[PDB]
Design a binder for this molecule. Structure first.
Ligand SMILES: NS(=O)(=O)c1cc2c(cc1Cl)NCNS2(=O)=O
Ligand SMILES: NS(=O)(=O)c1cc2c(cc1Cl)NCNS2(=O)=O
Ligand SMILES: NS(=O)(=O)c1cc2c(cc1Cl)NCNS2(=O)=O
Ligand SMILES: N[C@@H](CCC(=O)O)C(=O)O
Ligand SMILES: N[C@@H](CCC(=O)O)C(=O)O
Ligand SMILES: N[C@@H](CCC(=O)O)C(=O)O
Ligand SMILES: [Zn+2]
Ligand SMILES: [Zn+2]
Ligand SMILES: [Zn+2]
Lengths: 258, 258, 258
């Protein structure tokens, strides 16, 4: 049985090859998570098919219908065997799906346009001239919605009722907004994506401050799935052999344009 | 039924209180893991007894007999219900015990006496005047033993054969050897412990270079244990609520002496 | 009865003619082995149908299931009557299928990006900056796995545990890997394929050093198949009539682009 892999188009984890339409199957895609999937499958001894999640979301539970969307939804409702993506390990997700040990570490961070008068979250919360927001339907938004820490609680109170909305549908949208807002918009996003963008032309954004928190991306499988064990062991093995470090360098830094 | 907790005396995770002589049971101890254990037991709803692992080791497998020692052995042979300590999540351990999601990140790092002409692992490998080693029966030693990476491979070849031994029984002994070697001994140990010691009198050691790898500490339980599920969720909860960050600051930086 | 010929897409042995993807039967393909199959069929007096091996592999035996894949498997399990491809004559294969006398000689050799500081296998083995690998599921990989020769043994020890995998799925993937790795990847492959690629645009690769061994390609038929005798006699006749040399010139050197 070919394993169905749900993933998401997010640079540099999964990207369309410049010549996608003249290629087929897995060959259309490239990136950190494409390289990671290849190995995981090799070490676990399975065949797979990469598929981009339909709604383009990571995964959240609708408060009304209680239905899970995104990659999480694909696993919960039996559409996918495994998720290989920058999917954050969280308590609410861990209750409905299984995660491997983290294959990459990260934290919520601040992306600003270079020269923006902001050095930290506390700085953001103490002012109003500079707008700020997060990705919609992600772990970053939930972190702010749920936090009991004063600075973050305050930031959430502003963001949830700010208008027009400070939330974006895609990371790309968030970055575009920072770049076009002449320093009047700051974007809250995971450090890994912040670091990648920082190394790309036009080289006009920058990560400021330390991270607001600390967590990991995990490879996800449906609850109680037989894949979980092998996949978890493969991540540990690839970690120890230095593969993850190698892949980070290849897709983030070896490529640097700034 | 009272949960038997195995742990190890390692600053600032688990330390004897100054007035321990006049205290009983769990009260004799303090530190990050002592606080973590309390919250873990609170959220999982159990009573526990802290016990210091007899052989004072983290845990490795004897190549000849194939018996596990240290905290890993205690779990493997049914002498303990759970290990709450700076126990590194690794592939060989994960094959015999269960680990929670990481409660703390770290990497292998170099500790030197201030002023020592060393800036990196690569440096250490290119010279012979300055001896270097690691802790016996730990994940660090195993990291060098199993490493295919050129610089590390070379470092192991030198360590596994040097006389007198460059290996130490405890972290305290390793640190003491740095402090009294007049810069002729550098110690390879985890960045967490390195960073702690760097902030303590006589303030004569230093962490140099970056981390040689990236991994995590997990709470361990015997394979297939019922405790495992509840404990894992508890770690995720404590991470998200920010308690883990609070504990780190309390035990590492709030205390700073240098 | 129409003889079912199993073969594999490998330049310049068998190739899809430009714009023939939709066309019918044998006309679709061109190459050394297409010309060879024609002569063989003529001299043995049979009709045939060319088919491309389903899994795109040459043939190896799964250590776990003990099942043969690729063209070898097609013959072993009765899916095909004969294999006409750059199939290496080896001991493990000769035990389960029959081979004609060789129609072409070759050896394992090194392909590098022009300017790479490597002259020999020994060179490869004494350094770590430049990675190297081979095709998966082929006789080249098995040569290294089995060798008791010091240099090749040392190469296998590195290759079998390197991450990411140094092994490639197809010859084209290995070559693509050499061309894009800026001299950091050397590909081990059979000299005939290496010499072909050397004369093709972009003309940026090179064969270096001598061959590591010496062997031949044979036409393969199922054990005890009647076709065997006549096919073997046919190969010898083609060889003595100079037709194999003619075909070599036509598909390697008459074509040269560099
Ligand atoms: N920087 S990170 O790998 O170490 C990290 C990841 C997770 C935590 C805590 C930390 Cl410091 N909580 C448990 N789940 S998680 O997102 O993998
Ligand atoms: N720096 S760390 O917490 O994030 C980390 C820990 C582990 C990994 C990968 C990373 Cl980046 N592999 C899975 N097991 S582990 O030792 O907890
Ligand atoms: N270089 S050589 O051994 O491979 C070779 C030997 C014979 C041929 C053709 C070649 Cl290229 N004809 C078939 N019988 S043979 O004399 O062993
Ligand atoms: N990695 C996040 C998405 C990005 C973000 O929330 O900033 C998740 O799994 O939901
Ligand atoms: N944390 C390590 C011990 C310290 C070290 O190896 O440096 C372990 O779990 O084995
Ligand atoms: N000719 C080889 C395939 C190519 C290689 O292994 O290098 C074989 O028959 O297996
Ligand atoms: Zn609590
Ligand atoms: Zn035609
Ligand atoms: Zn691998």
């Amino acid at each position: 049985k070919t394993v169905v892999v749900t993933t998401i188009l997010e640079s540099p984890y999964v990207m369309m090859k410049k010549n996608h339409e003249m290629l087929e199957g897995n060959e259309r895609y490239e990136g950190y998570c494409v390289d990671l999937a290849a190995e995981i499958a090799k070490h676990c001894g399975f065949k797979y098919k990469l598929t981009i999640v339909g709604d383009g979301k990571y995964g959240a539970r609708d408060a009304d219908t209680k239905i899970w969307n995104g990659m999480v939804g694909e696993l919960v409702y039996g559409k996918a065997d495994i998720a290989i993506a920058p999917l954050t390990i969280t308590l609410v997700r861990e209750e409905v799906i299984d995660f491997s040990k983290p294959f990459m570490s990260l934290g919520i961070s601040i992306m600003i346009k270079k020269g923006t008068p902001i050095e930290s979250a506390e700085d953001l919360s103490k002012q109003t001239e500079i707008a700020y927001g997060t990705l919609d339907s992600g772990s970053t938004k939930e972190f702010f919605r749920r936090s009991k820490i004063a600075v973050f609680d305050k930031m959430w109170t502003y963001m949830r009722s700010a208008e027009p909305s400070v939330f974006v549908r895609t990371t790309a949208e968030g970055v575009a907004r920072v770049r076009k807002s002449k320093g009047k918009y700051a974007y809250l996003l995971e450090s890994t994506m912040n670091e990648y963008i920082e190394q790309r032309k036009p080289c006009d954004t920058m990560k400021v401050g330390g991270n607001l928190d600390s967590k990991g991306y995990g490879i996800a499988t449906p609850k109680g799935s037989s894949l979980g064990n092998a996949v978890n062991l493969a991540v540990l093995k690839l970690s120890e052999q230095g593969l993850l470090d190698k892949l980070k360098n290849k897709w983030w830094y070896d490529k640097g344009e700034c």
